Amino acid sequence: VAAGATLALLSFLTPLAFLLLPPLLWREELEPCGTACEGLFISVAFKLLILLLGSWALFFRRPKASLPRVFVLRALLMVLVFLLVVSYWLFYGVRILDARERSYQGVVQFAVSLVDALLFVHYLAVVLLELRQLQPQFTLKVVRSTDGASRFYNVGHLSIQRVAVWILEKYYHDFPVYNPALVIAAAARRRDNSHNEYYYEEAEHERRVRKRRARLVVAVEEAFTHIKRLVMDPREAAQAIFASMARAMQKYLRTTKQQPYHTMESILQHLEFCITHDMTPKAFLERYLAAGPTIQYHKERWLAKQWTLVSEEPVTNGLKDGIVFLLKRQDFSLVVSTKKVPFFKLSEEFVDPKSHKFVMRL
Amino acid sequence: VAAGATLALLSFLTPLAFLLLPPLLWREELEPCGTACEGLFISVAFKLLILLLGSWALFFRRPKASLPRVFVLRALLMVLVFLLVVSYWLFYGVRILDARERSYQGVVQFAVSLVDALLFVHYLAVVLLELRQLQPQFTLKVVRSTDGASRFYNVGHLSIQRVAVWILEKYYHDFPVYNPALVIAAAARRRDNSHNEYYYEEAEHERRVRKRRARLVVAVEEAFTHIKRLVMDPREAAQAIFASMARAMQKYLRTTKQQPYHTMESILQHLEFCITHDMTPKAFLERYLAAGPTIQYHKERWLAKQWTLVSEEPVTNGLKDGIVFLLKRQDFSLVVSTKKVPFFKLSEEFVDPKSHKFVMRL
Amino acid sequence: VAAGATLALLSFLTPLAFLLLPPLLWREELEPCGTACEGLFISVAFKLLILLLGSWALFFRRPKASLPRVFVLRALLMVLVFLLVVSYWLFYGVRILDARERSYQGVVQFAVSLVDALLFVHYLAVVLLELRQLQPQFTLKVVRSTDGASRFYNVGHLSIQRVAVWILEKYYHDFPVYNPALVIAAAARRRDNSHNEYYYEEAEHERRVRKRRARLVVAVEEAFTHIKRLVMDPREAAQAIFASMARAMQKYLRTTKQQPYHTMESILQHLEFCITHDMTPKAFLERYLAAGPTIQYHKERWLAKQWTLVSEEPVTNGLKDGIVFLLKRQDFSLVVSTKKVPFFKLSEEFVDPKSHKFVMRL
């Protein structure tokens, strides 16, 4: 990442060097030129300000991911910046600096062309890195291998590793959080005719979850009726009203297998959060009634540095119809299937709004 | 917004002024120049057409929101357009217009550099206003403070007010519509051991909602069997078949607290809409069975001009990990929590499709 | 589509022709020029490489749809490329080629202006085709006319046919798959007071779906316990463990009307898929328990070449508040209603985090 900052600093200082070396080295040898040179100095100044603000807006940011192989398009852009700036330096050396060029208008036009080329490389960087994948080309079915939480997405032309990082960004807010606490045909006919134990255990579990949920709703309502706006801190008020709801919260988190997701300190911080921002009991309970996504919880449960990209294809290739890859973790795996978004043939049919006529029969 | 139109008109007329003032003021004093000048006139004409079509496509539109503070990047762009065009006017005045420049090739190259700079400012405007927030940087948990309807979003680098307008654009089609019609530990142990009244009231409410829903489904099916395609207007046919379903619709909207959402005229317009476009009874009922989002209903219920941005941070700053802000309204409040999308470290693992081998034991 | 490739090849070869015809036709007549010409040759080479890589990244791809009328903005871009390149050819012919221009610096600057104009046309193409619709302007309610599956979307400034293709791209992964197997007021009062047959048939159907689902879950769990990692192919292992679950799968697909969606070969391929990628029984069953979207199934069920755009407005116009159009198919119709995203007026309200004070009463 240091080579990118080196290329950025060199590319920013190279037009200023190309403009400031002939007045510093051969000033009296240099030919005087008219107002066209100074107008091109103004163009260099404003276009370098545009280049600096654009590179600030899109490229002066930390890397959001560590890819297992090389970023192909970003390495292409770095090689393009390197070869462009090195070729401009080589030409400026062997045909302007060593030759002691007198026509300063040509040197300033050369710097103008350099800044135009750097702005066009910045535009190509936006095209390659951000604009290429806007048009949706593929539909991704992403399924957890453990509980079968499935979402579908539309993705554009990206490589498999960039699609993988994209899916991991969707995963932490789209799927529910992972919870690990949640002859032959004749034997199958004999077993399927037996007592349907799982049906009644499921009905018992749904019934007792609804009962513990009702106890929790009544507990948190009667808890939030113990305070009112106004001396007592929201931490102290949350600690006061937690005692009238800790037992029903503990019972509901035991019956829904959500015990290690919510410590007592996290529930106290979320109580302080809810009574600070004037949230009702139901807006408090929405964090606890359902499972909720992975980013809702503590950072020790994210484990975002422990993902593994398992693909039979080399992961720098783009997607195609039939690509399946795994986003493995120590706990589960995200199975990703790729299908091509199909070709559409729309036809146009005109109807008349007058032509909608009706009868009373059938 | 008038200053933006003034800057746009001035920036469009400034290259034409820079090209047309030397033939109008000093024509016989002006030096003749070759075909390079006329080729640059062609470049000025086509690049100004490109600039006009791009500014039409992205910037000749009404403001979608009224922000509580200044749009920082748009004011930066307006200051950049102003300082660029004013500096080109000052140089053209004090070094071309007052000096009566004879080298017309330099003046036309100066206008070419001006149009290139305006196209680069337009590109910087697209980078700052639209391309900066494409890369998702933050996950937003947006929760209504009243009923706890929660959605998560990925947002890029935006200020808090632009994130707020973005969330309000997501709110009108993502959340359901707001419906306002919907010692201590020993006392909590005594209360949680009492009769679970809320559980049975919830079961009674779900049962009677399912019964009124079944009555409504049978009513709307038998209502739509009273007409057929073909003389009778769809308004007249909707008014005819509404009488066989108005009672069950009124009972279902009473039992689900959806009475002021649906007037009789709105249900008649939606009946005319459904029988016009050949919609089934279930496609009619999907508007009424669930609550549905806020933009599905009448404009007096949107109240989009009554939002309030409550943030402890000054709202022109970008988001960071831990920003919480409220989108208050007179009825409720959207509590928005910001978390950073975590850094990913993908590793690559190669598996062999031949290496998937299986046994029959366990 | 051949005219677009012809314009692309002509636009790529035109600057090289403008640079290479004066050394090939009048070489000794041609005036020698300094290092400014060669620096502009370097600028032409790198900017043509930028133009080639950008046109590869965004425009060297197959059309994703067949629109019923002309793509208005793409035809505008093709007319702009055609008129620009034809005007540069006409000027180069009648003022450089026929006149036998000696000032070669003007010819090379003319080619530089041509490549700058082509890069600006490419930028305008990105603005018109991709950047115009990023800012969400409209909310689309898309409802199937048969079962009332409804989704809402935010769309930007697009024409009705491009919005239609956009909705069809959202449709194949957002909606569930279409399943066709799923005086007057006094008579309505008499019928609504009768036996609520549909309520009890619905409760019976939900109960038997839960029972067949429980049988299927137990069957697929006991089926996946018949194999283990390690000689036997995943096709052979899937065929072995399918016999202990085919009866409960067939019963669940009969009771949920999902019989023609899943052939025996498709279930065997998905079993091989799940045991290959170490998916649990629940991750196998997520494809079968719910309906799921249309792209999840076989390509004979997509029928993406059979959509019909029914609009009272001519479909090359952009959306506005109140546009309703149909995306008809032989089976159903997607009714699309357009509403304008409302204007927001945010106000700012500062609260003090110290000012959150609380009491114990009420």
Summed up:
The PDB classes it as membrane protein. The structure is cut from a larger assembly and holds three copies of chain A (362 residues). With 362 residues, chain A is an alpha+beta fold.
**Number of DSSP strands of chain A?**
9
Percent strand of chain A equals 5-15%
Largest sheet of chain A: 5 strands, antiparallel
Number of helices of chain A: 11
What is the terminal-to-terminal distance of chain A?
73 Å
Helix content of chain A: 40-55%
Oligomer: part of a larger assembly
Rg of chain A, Cα atoms, Å: 32 Å
Most extensive interface, residues per chain?
A-B, 93 and 90 residues
Helix/strand order of chain A: HHEHHEEHHHEHHHHEEEEE
**What structural class do helix, strand and pairing data of chain A support?**
alpha+beta
The spatial strand order of the largest sheet of chain A comes to: 3-2-7-6-5
Shape descriptor of chain A reads elongated
PDB class: membrane protein
Keywords: vangl, Planar cell polarity, PCP, Prickle1, membrane protein
Entry title: Human VANGL2 in complex with a PK1 peptide (residues 745-790)
Chains A, B, C: Vang-like protein 2
What can you tell me about this protein's structure?
The structure is cut from a larger assembly and holds three copies of chain A (362 residues). Chain A has 362 residues and is α+β, with helices and mostly antiparallel strands. Chain A has eleven helices and nine strands. In chain A, strands 3-2-7-6-5 form a five-stranded antiparallel β-sheet, covered by helices on one side. Chain A is elongated. In chain A, strand 6 and strand 7 form a beta hairpin. Helix content of chain A is 54%, strand content 12%. At the A-C interface, helix 3, helix 4, strand 2, strand 3 and helix 6 of A face helix 2, strand 1, helix 4, helix 5 and helix 7 of C. Strand 5 (307-311) of chain A pairs parallel with strand 8 of chain B, so a sheet runs across the interface. It is classed as membrane protein. Keywords: vangl, Planar cell polarity, PCP, Prickle1, membrane protein. Human VANGL2 in complex with a PK1 peptide (residues 745-790).
